[PDB]
Each structure stands twice: as C-alpha cells, then as structure tokens.
Amino acid sequence: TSVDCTAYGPELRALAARLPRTPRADLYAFLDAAHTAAASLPGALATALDTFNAEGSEDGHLLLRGLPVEADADLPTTPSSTPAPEDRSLLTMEAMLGLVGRRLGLHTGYRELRSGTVYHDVYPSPGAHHLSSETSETLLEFHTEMAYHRLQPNYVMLACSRADHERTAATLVASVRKALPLLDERTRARLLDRRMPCCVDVAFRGGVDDPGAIAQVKPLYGDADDPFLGYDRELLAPEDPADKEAVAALSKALDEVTEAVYLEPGDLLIVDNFRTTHARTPFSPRWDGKDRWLHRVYIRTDRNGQLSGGERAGDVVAFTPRG
C-alpha cells in the first residue's frame, strides 16, 4: 500500500522542526516530542497509518513516498561504522521515522544488537556477514526480523536518505495474506501453531545451555483464517520430513507472491513484521562516501505480547528466545 506524500512537504518539514536537534542526547525526550507532533500529521497520512496499524494490508507493507529529505549534497558522508555519535544532528528522514514511528507505537532497541542503539544506519560494509544489513553483493534472503525473539517488533521501518548509485538494490516483501491461499489445507494445518527449532542471528548467539534452550518459532500462528507468519530462510530448522515439506511449500508460496520496491531518497517503508518477510537484492558499493544509506527503527505495539507495562519509546530490551 502506498501514499504519495509530496504535497505534505511543507507541513512535514514543519513537524520535523518541532523536534530536538540532537536526538540521541536525550532520546526519550526526542521521541516524546515526536509523539506530540504525530497528532498533527496531515489527515490522509494519519488515516493511512492508523488503518495499517490496526488492520495491516493484503500486501503487508505501507510505503510513504516523497517525504522531505535533504538534497544529496546537504547530507553527511555515508556512515562507515556503528554506533552513531550521540551528538549527530538530526536528519530529516530520522525525524520522519520519529513522527511516523510514534503514530504507530514504541521505538525499541535490542541490547545485543547494534550496541543497544535505537536508530540504526544501514549501509554497505566490506566482508559483511551473509545475514547482515551490511550486505551488498550477496542477496539478503527473505526473513521475518527476529522471529525467534519473545520481544520481536510488530514493525520494521526503513527510511531512505541515499539510494545506491545505480539504483539496483530492491527491497522485496512477501505477505502471508497473499501466500496463504496458495497453500493446501494439509500444509496450512501442519504449519499452524507448530513449534520448530530456529537458530538466531549473530548478535544474539551464546548462552544456549542445551538443545532444549534453542528458540522455537511457529511458522504460522494465531487466527487460522488470518494467521501471523514467522519465517527465516536461513535460520529456521524444521526436523521431521513433513515439517520440512511444509516449510518448503511456504517458502515457495512466499517467493511466488514477492513484491519489489526500490527505495529512493524520501521513501519510508513500513513492513508488518508479524505478516511479511523482507529481503534485498544485490548492489555494488563504490566506497566513495555516497553509498546507499537507510535509517532503521523497530516499533512495538499492543499486539500479541510485545508489552507488559511501563514501556517507553526509546527503551532497549534484552534477549529471551521464544519457546
């Protein structure tokens, strides 16, 4: 689902100007300012966000196009490392992630990931691990983000400050609502609410006492007529022949319903992480200071066990595997 925000430029630039200019120096105050400002988002944008937040969509994502973004020459050099300096001045796409993010829910950091930070710069880095956002030449395979984490976020938001030079990197999404109809009843029944072993990303490894402590992921769960999805192409490890068969059918159906989006500066993609897997195709970095640069945040909502009380936008949570 897409929303052309070009006409909202003036109003959005003004809302961004309401926010503290050094976000990380007091991130709780920054996100509180963004929440108050979110109540003034242009009506059609606010309605699209609230509708997506409550209902999701058949295609599993909400793409905002044409948000205000700095001209290329007016942006800093593309980052070469993580974490970001706490003194970094606010970028317009970060302001948009603050506004749009708080309209949906609570920004959340993960202790073991990206130094426990909340705003993550996504840029290519040499020798990247194959499951990493730092990849470029190799395809980043379809996966639900942190499917194995008890505190898995409802949304992953990606805002583009710079696209790759040749604009070849495409962000791919596959929605369980489009894939499900392609599966037969036997396959759906096998997957629904069925726990299967799942490895975790690099950041969360360590401390696994035995095979019994390995995370367990239900590939489909919830309402049988409109299930949530948990899938990770590389990490999910079905053991019985029937489970493998079922996961392979699910993998094929997701491939068959793949939708591609080329993020350009000013674009902000909201992925429904409980119903949609995402991936990114290959691109070749130039290592010239102007490589692809996205900003990523994770958003928790009141849906399914993400919150237990007292949480604030800006909190950083620790790891607990599902199971």
PDB file of N, CA and C in Angstrom, residues 218-289:
ATOM      1  N   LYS A 218       6.898 -20.652  15.473  1.00  0.00           N
ATOM      2  CA  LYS A 218       5.706 -21.241  14.833  1.00  0.00           C
ATOM      3  C   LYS A 218       5.652 -20.535  13.475  1.00  0.00           C
ATOM      4  N   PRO A 219       5.799 -21.278  12.375  1.00  0.00           N
ATOM      5  CA  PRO A 219       5.767 -20.596  11.067  1.00  0.00           C
ATOM      6  C   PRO A 219       4.458 -19.844  10.786  1.00  0.00           C
ATOM      7  N   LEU A 220       3.324 -20.386  11.229  1.00  0.00           N
ATOM      8  CA  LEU A 220       2.040 -19.684  11.124  1.00  0.00           C
ATOM      9  C   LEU A 220       1.498 -19.798  12.541  1.00  0.00           C
ATOM     10  N   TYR A 221       0.803 -18.769  13.002  1.00  0.00           N
ATOM     11  CA  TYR A 221       0.200 -18.805  14.326  1.00  0.00           C
ATOM     12  C   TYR A 221      -0.949 -17.817  14.416  1.00  0.00           C
ATOM     13  N   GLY A 222      -1.803 -17.991  15.432  1.00  0.00           N
ATOM     14  CA  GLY A 222      -2.926 -17.088  15.591  1.00  0.00           C
ATOM     15  C   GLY A 222      -4.138 -17.581  14.843  1.00  0.00           C
ATOM     16  N   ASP A 223      -5.029 -16.653  14.544  1.00  0.00           N
ATOM     17  CA  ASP A 223      -6.263 -16.943  13.815  1.00  0.00           C
ATOM     18  C   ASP A 223      -6.002 -17.813  12.586  1.00  0.00           C
ATOM     19  N   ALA A 224      -6.596 -18.997  12.534  1.00  0.00           N
ATOM     20  CA  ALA A 224      -6.347 -19.874  11.383  1.00  0.00           C
ATOM     21  C   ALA A 224      -6.772 -19.285  10.022  1.00  0.00           C
ATOM     22  N   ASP A 225      -7.768 -18.404  10.021  1.00  0.00           N
ATOM     23  CA  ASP A 225      -8.195 -17.795   8.766  1.00  0.00           C
ATOM     24  C   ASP A 225      -7.376 -16.549   8.378  1.00  0.00           C
ATOM     25  N   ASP A 226      -6.526 -16.061   9.284  1.00  0.00           N
ATOM     26  CA  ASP A 226      -5.712 -14.875   9.001  1.00  0.00           C
ATOM     27  C   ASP A 226      -4.493 -14.922   9.933  1.00  0.00           C
ATOM     28  N   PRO A 227      -3.682 -15.977   9.812  1.00  0.00           N
ATOM     29  CA  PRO A 227      -2.510 -16.135  10.662  1.00  0.00           C
ATOM     30  C   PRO A 227      -1.368 -15.156  10.502  1.00  0.00           C
ATOM     31  N   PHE A 228      -0.590 -15.068  11.569  1.00  0.00           N
ATOM     32  CA  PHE A 228       0.647 -14.289  11.559  1.00  0.00           C
ATOM     33  C   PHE A 228       1.673 -15.281  10.993  1.00  0.00           C
ATOM     34  N   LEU A 229       2.826 -14.746  10.622  1.00  0.00           N
ATOM     35  CA  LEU A 229       3.907 -15.514   9.991  1.00  0.00           C
ATOM     36  C   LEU A 229       5.235 -15.319  10.690  1.00  0.00           C
ATOM     37  N   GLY A 230       5.971 -16.405  10.832  1.00  0.00           N
ATOM     38  CA  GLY A 230       7.303 -16.343  11.409  1.00  0.00           C
ATOM     39  C   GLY A 230       8.176 -17.169  10.467  1.00  0.00           C
ATOM     40  N   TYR A 231       9.089 -16.542   9.723  1.00  0.00           N
ATOM     41  CA  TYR A 231       9.878 -17.310   8.755  1.00  0.00           C
ATOM     42  C   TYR A 231      11.271 -16.769   8.599  1.00  0.00           C
ATOM     43  N   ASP A 232      12.251 -17.644   8.499  1.00  0.00           N
ATOM     44  CA  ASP A 232      13.592 -17.147   8.273  1.00  0.00           C
ATOM     45  C   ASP A 232      14.248 -18.195   7.408  1.00  0.00           C
ATOM     46  N   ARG A 233      14.550 -17.832   6.170  1.00  0.00           N
ATOM     47  CA  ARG A 233      15.081 -18.807   5.234  1.00  0.00           C
ATOM     48  C   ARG A 233      16.327 -19.563   5.648  1.00  0.00           C
ATOM     49  N   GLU A 234      17.232 -18.845   6.288  1.00  0.00           N
ATOM     50  CA  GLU A 234      18.476 -19.423   6.729  1.00  0.00           C
ATOM     51  C   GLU A 234      18.438 -20.018   8.130  1.00  0.00           C
ATOM     52  N   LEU A 235      17.673 -19.416   9.029  1.00  0.00           N
ATOM     53  CA  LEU A 235      17.709 -19.862  10.418  1.00  0.00           C
ATOM     54  C   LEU A 235      16.719 -20.909  10.911  1.00  0.00           C
ATOM     55  N   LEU A 236      15.563 -21.033  10.249  1.00  0.00           N
ATOM     56  CA  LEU A 236      14.551 -21.978  10.694  1.00  0.00           C
ATOM     57  C   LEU A 236      15.025 -23.375  10.352  1.00  0.00           C
ATOM     58  N   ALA A 237      14.943 -24.293  11.309  1.00  0.00           N
ATOM     59  CA  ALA A 237      15.418 -25.660  11.099  1.00  0.00           C
ATOM     60  C   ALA A 237      14.410 -26.785  11.365  1.00  0.00           C
ATOM     61  N   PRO A 238      13.378 -26.915  10.518  1.00  0.00           N
ATOM     62  CA  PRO A 238      12.368 -27.981  10.691  1.00  0.00           C
ATOM     63  C   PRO A 238      13.065 -29.352  10.770  1.00  0.00           C
ATOM     64  N   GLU A 239      12.608 -30.242  11.651  1.00  0.00           N
ATOM     65  CA  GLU A 239      13.279 -31.539  11.763  1.00  0.00           C
ATOM     66  C   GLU A 239      12.605 -32.729  11.071  1.00  0.00           C
ATOM     67  N   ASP A 240      11.291 -32.918  11.238  1.00  0.00           N
ATOM     68  CA  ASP A 240      10.590 -34.039  10.581  1.00  0.00           C
ATOM     69  C   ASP A 240      10.355 -33.825   9.098  1.00  0.00           C
ATOM     70  N   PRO A 241      10.371 -34.918   8.334  1.00  0.00           N
ATOM     71  CA  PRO A 241      10.160 -34.788   6.888  1.00  0.00           C
ATOM     72  C   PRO A 241       8.921 -33.946   6.530  1.00  0.00           C
ATOM     73  N   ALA A 242       7.802 -34.131   7.258  1.00  0.00           N
ATOM     74  CA  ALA A 242       6.548 -33.391   6.961  1.00  0.00           C
ATOM     75  C   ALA A 242       6.684 -31.904   7.237  1.00  0.00           C
ATOM     76  N   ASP A 243       7.472 -31.560   8.257  1.00  0.00           N
ATOM     77  CA  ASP A 243       7.711 -30.160   8.596  1.00  0.00           C
ATOM     78  C   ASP A 243       8.575 -29.508   7.518  1.00  0.00           C
ATOM     79  N   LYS A 244       9.582 -30.230   7.041  1.00  0.00           N
ATOM     80  CA  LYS A 244      10.460 -29.705   6.019  1.00  0.00           C
ATOM     81  C   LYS A 244       9.644 -29.452   4.773  1.00  0.00           C
ATOM     82  N   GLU A 245       8.801 -30.427   4.433  1.00  0.00           N
ATOM     83  CA  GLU A 245       7.925 -30.354   3.247  1.00  0.00           C
ATOM     84  C   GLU A 245       7.015 -29.126   3.331  1.00  0.00           C
ATOM     85  N   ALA A 246       6.442 -28.919   4.511  1.00  0.00           N
ATOM     86  CA  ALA A 246       5.526 -27.813   4.751  1.00  0.00           C
ATOM     87  C   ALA A 246       6.229 -26.470   4.686  1.00  0.00           C
ATOM     88  N   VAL A 247       7.419 -26.385   5.277  1.00  0.00           N
ATOM     89  CA  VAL A 247       8.164 -25.122   5.241  1.00  0.00           C
ATOM     90  C   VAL A 247       8.630 -24.818   3.809  1.00  0.00           C
ATOM     91  N   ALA A 248       8.984 -25.848   3.051  1.00  0.00           N
ATOM     92  CA  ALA A 248       9.402 -25.622   1.656  1.00  0.00           C
ATOM     93  C   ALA A 248       8.216 -25.104   0.794  1.00  0.00           C
ATOM     94  N   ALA A 249       7.005 -25.571   1.074  1.00  0.00           N
ATOM     95  CA  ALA A 249       5.820 -25.112   0.341  1.00  0.00           C
ATOM     96  C   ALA A 249       5.549 -23.664   0.714  1.00  0.00           C
ATOM     97  N   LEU A 250       5.706 -23.351   2.003  1.00  0.00           N
ATOM     98  CA  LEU A 250       5.504 -21.967   2.461  1.00  0.00           C
ATOM     99  C   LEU A 250       6.553 -21.064   1.771  1.00  0.00           C
ATOM    100  N   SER A 251       7.800 -21.512   1.710  1.00  0.00           N
ATOM    101  CA  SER A 251       8.892 -20.754   1.068  1.00  0.00           C
ATOM    102  C   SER A 251       8.574 -20.504  -0.398  1.00  0.00           C
ATOM    103  N   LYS A 252       8.028 -21.514  -1.064  1.00  0.00           N
ATOM    104  CA  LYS A 252       7.696 -21.350  -2.485  1.00  0.00           C
ATOM    105  C   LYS A 252       6.569 -20.356  -2.695  1.00  0.00           C
ATOM    106  N   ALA A 253       5.536 -20.452  -1.864  1.00  0.00           N
ATOM    107  CA  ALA A 253       4.400 -19.524  -1.969  1.00  0.00           C
ATOM    108  C   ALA A 253       4.870 -18.089  -1.694  1.00  0.00           C
ATOM    109  N   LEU A 254       5.764 -17.888  -0.707  1.00  0.00           N
ATOM    110  CA  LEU A 254       6.220 -16.522  -0.450  1.00  0.00           C
ATOM    111  C   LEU A 254       6.972 -15.991  -1.679  1.00  0.00           C
ATOM    112  N   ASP A 255       7.811 -16.832  -2.281  1.00  0.00           N
ATOM    113  CA  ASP A 255       8.540 -16.404  -3.457  1.00  0.00           C
ATOM    114  C   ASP A 255       7.564 -15.987  -4.534  1.00  0.00           C
ATOM    115  N   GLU A 256       6.515 -16.783  -4.738  1.00  0.00           N
ATOM    116  CA  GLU A 256       5.561 -16.533  -5.814  1.00  0.00           C
ATOM    117  C   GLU A 256       4.746 -15.275  -5.630  1.00  0.00           C
ATOM    118  N   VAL A 257       4.677 -14.760  -4.399  1.00  0.00           N
ATOM    119  CA  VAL A 257       3.924 -13.521  -4.171  1.00  0.00           C
ATOM    120  C   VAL A 257       4.827 -12.308  -3.867  1.00  0.00           C
ATOM    121  N   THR A 258       6.141 -12.465  -4.062  1.00  0.00           N
ATOM    122  CA  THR A 258       7.104 -11.370  -3.893  1.00  0.00           C
ATOM    123  C   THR A 258       6.740 -10.058  -4.615  1.00  0.00           C
ATOM    124  N   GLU A 259       6.875  -8.945  -3.880  1.00  0.00           N
ATOM    125  CA  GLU A 259       6.659  -7.604  -4.423  1.00  0.00           C
ATOM    126  C   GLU A 259       7.976  -6.863  -4.232  1.00  0.00           C
ATOM    127  N   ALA A 260       8.403  -6.126  -5.250  1.00  0.00           N
ATOM    128  CA  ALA A 260       9.659  -5.384  -5.166  1.00  0.00           C
ATOM    129  C   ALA A 260       9.440  -3.884  -5.098  1.00  0.00           C
ATOM    130  N   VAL A 261      10.211  -3.220  -4.227  1.00  0.00           N
ATOM    131  CA  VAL A 261      10.165  -1.760  -4.044  1.00  0.00           C
ATOM    132  C   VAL A 261      11.581  -1.212  -4.117  1.00  0.00           C
ATOM    133  N   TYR A 262      11.778  -0.187  -4.941  1.00  0.00           N
ATOM    134  CA  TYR A 262      13.088   0.460  -4.993  1.00  0.00           C
ATOM    135  C   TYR A 262      12.990   1.709  -4.123  1.00  0.00           C
ATOM    136  N   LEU A 263      13.679   1.706  -2.984  1.00  0.00           N
ATOM    137  CA  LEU A 263      13.617   2.867  -2.121  1.00  0.00           C
ATOM    138  C   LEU A 263      14.492   3.974  -2.674  1.00  0.00           C
ATOM    139  N   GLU A 264      13.923   5.168  -2.796  1.00  0.00           N
ATOM    140  CA  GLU A 264      14.710   6.302  -3.244  1.00  0.00           C
ATOM    141  C   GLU A 264      14.715   7.333  -2.126  1.00  0.00           C
ATOM    142  N   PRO A 265      15.592   8.342  -2.214  1.00  0.00           N
ATOM    143  CA  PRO A 265      15.583   9.318  -1.111  1.00  0.00           C
ATOM    144  C   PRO A 265      14.182   9.889  -0.860  1.00  0.00           C
ATOM    145  N   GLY A 266      13.788   9.945   0.410  1.00  0.00           N
ATOM    146  CA  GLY A 266      12.465  10.430   0.729  1.00  0.00           C
ATOM    147  C   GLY A 266      11.446   9.330   0.945  1.00  0.00           C
ATOM    148  N   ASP A 267      11.824   8.088   0.654  1.00  0.00           N
ATOM    149  CA  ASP A 267      10.879   6.987   0.839  1.00  0.00           C
ATOM    150  C   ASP A 267      11.032   6.345   2.223  1.00  0.00           C
ATOM    151  N   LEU A 268       9.904   5.958   2.820  1.00  0.00           N
ATOM    152  CA  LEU A 268       9.921   5.291   4.124  1.00  0.00           C
ATOM    153  C   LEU A 268       8.994   4.075   4.030  1.00  0.00           C
ATOM    154  N   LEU A 269       9.561   2.888   4.221  1.00  0.00           N
ATOM    155  CA  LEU A 269       8.832   1.646   4.116  1.00  0.00           C
ATOM    156  C   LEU A 269       8.525   1.085   5.491  1.00  0.00           C
ATOM    157  N   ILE A 270       7.247   0.798   5.738  1.00  0.00           N
ATOM    158  CA  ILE A 270       6.828   0.180   6.974  1.00  0.00           C
ATOM    159  C   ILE A 270       6.472  -1.277   6.690  1.00  0.00           C
ATOM    160  N   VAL A 271       7.268  -2.207   7.204  1.00  0.00           N
ATOM    161  CA  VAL A 271       6.974  -3.639   6.979  1.00  0.00           C
ATOM    162  C   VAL A 271       6.211  -4.233   8.195  1.00  0.00           C
ATOM    163  N   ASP A 272       5.121  -4.942   7.936  1.00  0.00           N
ATOM    164  CA  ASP A 272       4.356  -5.606   9.017  1.00  0.00           C
ATOM    165  C   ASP A 272       5.137  -6.872   9.318  1.00  0.00           C
ATOM    166  N   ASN A 273       5.963  -6.797  10.354  1.00  0.00           N
ATOM    167  CA  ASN A 273       6.883  -7.874  10.690  1.00  0.00           C
ATOM    168  C   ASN A 273       6.214  -9.094  11.276  1.00  0.00           C
ATOM    169  N   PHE A 274       4.909  -9.022  11.537  1.00  0.00           N
ATOM    170  CA  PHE A 274       4.267 -10.241  12.008  1.00  0.00           C
ATOM    171  C   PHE A 274       3.506 -10.888  10.819  1.00  0.00           C
ATOM    172  N   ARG A 275       3.592 -10.314   9.603  1.00  0.00           N
ATOM    173  CA  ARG A 275       2.834 -10.905   8.476  1.00  0.00           C
ATOM    174  C   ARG A 275       3.601 -10.887   7.187  1.00  0.00           C
ATOM    175  N   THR A 276       4.822 -10.359   7.206  1.00  0.00           N
ATOM    176  CA  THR A 276       5.564 -10.159   5.947  1.00  0.00           C
ATOM    177  C   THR A 276       7.047 -10.399   6.138  1.00  0.00           C
ATOM    178  N   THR A 277       7.689 -11.137   5.221  1.00  0.00           N
ATOM    179  CA  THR A 277       9.141 -11.354   5.239  1.00  0.00           C
ATOM    180  C   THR A 277       9.758 -10.308   4.283  1.00  0.00           C
ATOM    181  N   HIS A 278      11.020  -9.953   4.502  1.00  0.00           N
ATOM    182  CA  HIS A 278      11.664  -8.990   3.606  1.00  0.00           C
ATOM    183  C   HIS A 278      13.074  -9.458   3.227  1.00  0.00           C
ATOM    184  N   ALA A 279      13.589  -8.888   2.148  1.00  0.00           N
ATOM    185  CA  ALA A 279      14.882  -9.263   1.583  1.00  0.00           C
ATOM    186  C   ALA A 279      15.419  -8.085   0.812  1.00  0.00           C
ATOM    187  N   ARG A 280      16.650  -8.182   0.276  1.00  0.00           N
ATOM    188  CA  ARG A 280      17.166  -7.080  -0.520  1.00  0.00           C
ATOM    189  C   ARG A 280      18.065  -7.662  -1.603  1.00  0.00           C
ATOM    190  N   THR A 281      17.891  -7.216  -2.848  1.00  0.00           N
ATOM    191  CA  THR A 281      18.686  -7.758  -3.938  1.00  0.00           C
ATOM    192  C   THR A 281      20.084  -7.162  -3.954  1.00  0.00           C
ATOM    193  N   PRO A 282      20.973  -7.722  -4.773  1.00  0.00           N
ATOM    194  CA  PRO A 282      22.349  -7.224  -4.836  1.00  0.00           C
ATOM    195  C   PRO A 282      22.625  -5.831  -5.429  1.00  0.00           C
ATOM    196  N   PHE A 283      23.690  -5.219  -4.945  1.00  0.00           N
ATOM    197  CA  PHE A 283      24.159  -3.947  -5.491  1.00  0.00           C
ATOM    198  C   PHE A 283      25.659  -3.882  -5.212  1.00  0.00           C
ATOM    199  N   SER A 284      26.379  -3.073  -5.986  1.00  0.00           N
ATOM    200  CA  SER A 284      27.839  -2.965  -5.823  1.00  0.00           C
ATOM    201  C   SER A 284      28.244  -1.620  -5.263  1.00  0.00           C
ATOM    202  N   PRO A 285      28.793  -1.601  -4.030  1.00  0.00           N
ATOM    203  CA  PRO A 285      29.213  -0.345  -3.416  1.00  0.00           C
ATOM    204  C   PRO A 285      30.421   0.269  -4.111  1.00  0.00           C
ATOM    205  N   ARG A 286      30.546   1.585  -3.987  1.00  0.00           N
ATOM    206  CA  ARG A 286      31.670   2.302  -4.567  1.00  0.00           C
ATOM    207  C   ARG A 286      32.684   2.704  -3.504  1.00  0.00           C
ATOM    208  N   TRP A 287      32.268   2.690  -2.234  1.00  0.00           N
ATOM    209  CA  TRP A 287      33.190   3.049  -1.137  1.00  0.00           C
ATOM    210  C   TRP A 287      33.697   4.463  -1.370  1.00  0.00           C
ATOM    211  N   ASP A 288      32.781   5.329  -1.801  1.00  0.00           N
ATOM    212  CA  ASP A 288      33.084   6.711  -2.133  1.00  0.00           C
ATOM    213  C   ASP A 288      32.491   7.797  -1.234  1.00  0.00           C
ATOM    214  N   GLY A 289      31.893   7.390  -0.128  1.00  0.00           N
ATOM    215  CA  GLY A 289      31.306   8.367   0.770  1.00  0.00           C
ATOM    216  C   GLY A 289      29.831   8.676   0.494  1.00  0.00           C
TER     217      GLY A 289
END
